Amino acid sequence: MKISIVGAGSVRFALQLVEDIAQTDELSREDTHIYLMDVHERRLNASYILARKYVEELNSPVKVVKTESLDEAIEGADFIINTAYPYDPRYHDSGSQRWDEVTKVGEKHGYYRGIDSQELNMVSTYTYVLSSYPDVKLALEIAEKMKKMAPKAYLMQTANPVFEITQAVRRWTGANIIGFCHGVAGVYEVFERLGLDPEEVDWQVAGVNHGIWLNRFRYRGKDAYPLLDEWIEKELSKWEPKNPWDTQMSPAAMDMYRFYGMLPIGDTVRNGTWKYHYNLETKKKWFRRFGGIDNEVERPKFHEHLRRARERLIKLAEEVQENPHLKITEKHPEIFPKGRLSGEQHIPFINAIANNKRVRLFLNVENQGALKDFPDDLVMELPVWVDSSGIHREKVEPDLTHRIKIFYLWPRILRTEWNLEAFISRDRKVLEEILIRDPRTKSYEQVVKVLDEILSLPFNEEIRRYYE
Amino acid sequence: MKISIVGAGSVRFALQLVEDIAQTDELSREDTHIYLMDVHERRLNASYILARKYVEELNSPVKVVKTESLDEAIEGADFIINTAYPYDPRYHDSGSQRWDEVTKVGEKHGYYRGIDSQELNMVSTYTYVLSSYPDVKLALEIAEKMKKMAPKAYLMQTANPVFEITQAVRRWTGANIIGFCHGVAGVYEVFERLGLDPEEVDWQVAGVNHGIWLNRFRYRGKDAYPLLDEWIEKELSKWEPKNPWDTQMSPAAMDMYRFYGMLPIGDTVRNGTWKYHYNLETKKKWFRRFGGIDNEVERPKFHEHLRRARERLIKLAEEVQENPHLKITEKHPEIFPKGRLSGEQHIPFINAIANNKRVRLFLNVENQGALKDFPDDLVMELPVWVDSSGIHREKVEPDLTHRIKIFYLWPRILRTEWNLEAFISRDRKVLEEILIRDPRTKSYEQVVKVLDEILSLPFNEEIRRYYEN
Ligand SMILES: [Mn+2]
Ligand SMILES: [Mn+2]
């Protein structure tokens, strides 16, 4: 089989994908070809060398290939993983650096954390100038190529905005796309914090990408929510975040639980109303110490760490290339483990589809009735069981609460429709209309000016012309 | 037949209803009984005397009765017209005055035009502290009474919020309510400005209460929107409103037309985004001279005007009580016309249901498939044909645009659900959550304080306790 990783320049992630493949029995065979593709020659090479080296040390028969041709990566593929984050190397070092520059423009026009930060949509680098033109455009191009050169492949969309893109591709191309995100892993924080063994809990989450809720939580044959209530009464007050990313049991999470009736899970906790996000001091009240990860201090700090980690991997690539005796699985155990899968859903999905290794996943697929009061065709993030017969929606029960539907999911669904409309219409009036619905907007003149300046940045030339 | 007017203390409207009934040939009969009910004795009395006086001057066999009892008004009714605007007379002269005071508290806390003014919801006196407790409570009470004591009657809801109340009554009691509003009449304004004969226009509107769109506009066999475009290019810049209410052809309405692809009709124009409403100066840019009717200047002024008109009718009632020879149809023809219906929808509806006089109306009724992409059970404002077999939904064609659905109607529907949840949940957190979605909210502490003060007002004690555990 042929597994293609588009955007392999994202080195650490591409490596953890390869590692997961080489460590998976059913997939660790001679006829498993992994194609690594990216336009960035040096980042691609670093992933390539560290990937081949890793499989050699693991003694895995898997073949690793690299290429700079999208078409070559796609042709005849069985699985295509889209993790690309387009950017202009003349102006920026990465997509996240471009997002950061635009965010700063927004901030000077009075939009704290940028125009792309909206109610229920605070997750950083999720959308770009609202309609995410570069990311949607690329996914659509991949989807259309896949329909002709790889008619049986799954497009595994990991690049953001996952919700908008999966929905756009489905609606406009009919391509075989499935959105992947792993905010569901926040549920293990909850179990731990409450002193529960994960394998003794009967749970389910459902909702929308970065918008999922613990609809079922049961322990020793009963509702386990009373246990959370106890923890809130006794432990919430003294809760402290272990790092900027640590929000699952935060005051914001529990305030949302109090209102909605179920606990928001994972990135859902980041995606709250402005109640929790007005400014950095408000964020520190609701997430404590760091103010979470989506703020002016922590986010640029995170991106810088990413950049450095990547540059270390590139250097390490150089090392192994000159000293073929280097043992990376010994030198750097955390980056190159041998008994530890990443925990990411991508490779289990592949093993499930190809090899009938049945597993429960949480993926962005069309609703088709799983959630009542939502359209069949709406892409949602659902519990599904996957095997070689395909993707089977688990019955969602109990249902999501009324408040979650009317106050959280529906408003998020409408924003998806607004962002999609902003992309397809090529109409600047839609971009304006979105900002007019933005609580931070104080005047129409403000809306016009922030968009004028953002669309006039030199690296946004194509986007500016698109809306002209 | 028994036609009950609940809230007949709203003198001029109650008279308009009586007048239409008396001038309707199939309803002018001695077994047509019009009950006027209201807890306000003076006002009820004035409606009562002027009503009986008018039906005499017309020689109608219609019987007019007055009662301060809700139960008596409802018992055995065939049609119940709820036009009540509940208010505590210990504190205020009317519902409007109460709304005005609360609005000022909100403005003091930084909410221009009050917390009850929200995006797509600028119409003054439409909701009251978001959940409209007094008005929703009353409608529900009437609904349950009606199901028991008037099992076949129609509840014709006129009092606001019509959308919220109609939906709530349908969902929680399943009672036989239909919502009535007259925004659709802005369409004739469009025809007049374009120089078109109202009788030779093929038109349709659809959407939601105070949220309707001119989805079909055809003239002499051709889409007539090109004529609107023509008018915009030639006349818009010099357009001027005739009074604070004149907004149908405003720059606001046209700006919405340009974005959505269809013209907002009637009160829909008042119900825009904050783009047209940030402050009085912004209102004047988009609605010209007066800044429309929903502002700190024109609305109190209109409310005082109403109070003044009501008081003149009460004084006239006295005049007639002490001079049975006065002919009020002569003294004030404008107020007491003959051979001239108001143009309102309520009495034609009654004539259609009762006597099979078939008529096309625009009413709030369950969607039931009329509009694609909306639930069957959602209450919407639809073109319907009415007769003794009931309500027949006209085919809606052309469809409402995508933008109208995703940017206007759906956001409007969600707000109705928010407002409903704010009522039945008895939960103050829901009132808070709504203000948290509000642009003029700058902090949570602001939200807490504005609701605290509003709920602590002496006349809001019932609501205050309702929201307490
Ligand atoms: Mn994610
Ligand atoms: Mn109305």
Short mmCIF file of C-alpha atoms and ligand atoms in Angstrom, two decimals, chain A residues 123 126 158 160 162 180-183 209-210 267, ligand 1:
data_model
loop_
_atom_site.label_atom_id
_atom_site.label_comp_id
_atom_site.label_asym_id
_atom_site.label_seq_id
_atom_site.Cartn_x
_atom_site.Cartn_y
_atom_site.Cartn_z
CA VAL A 123 -7.97 28.15 18.84
CA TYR A 126 -7.31 27.77 13.01
CA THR A 158 -5.22 17.33 9.37
CA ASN A 160 -6.77 23.62 9.62
CA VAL A 162 -10.42 21.05 9.67
CA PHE A 180 -8.73 14.33 11.81
CA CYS A 181 -8.27 15.97 15.21
CA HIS A 182 -7.43 14.58 18.63
CA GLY A 183 -8.83 16.96 21.23
CA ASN A 209 -14.38 19.81 15.50
CA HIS A 210 -12.90 21.56 18.58
CA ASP A 267 -9.88 22.18 22.35
MN MN C 1 -7.28 19.87 16.32
#
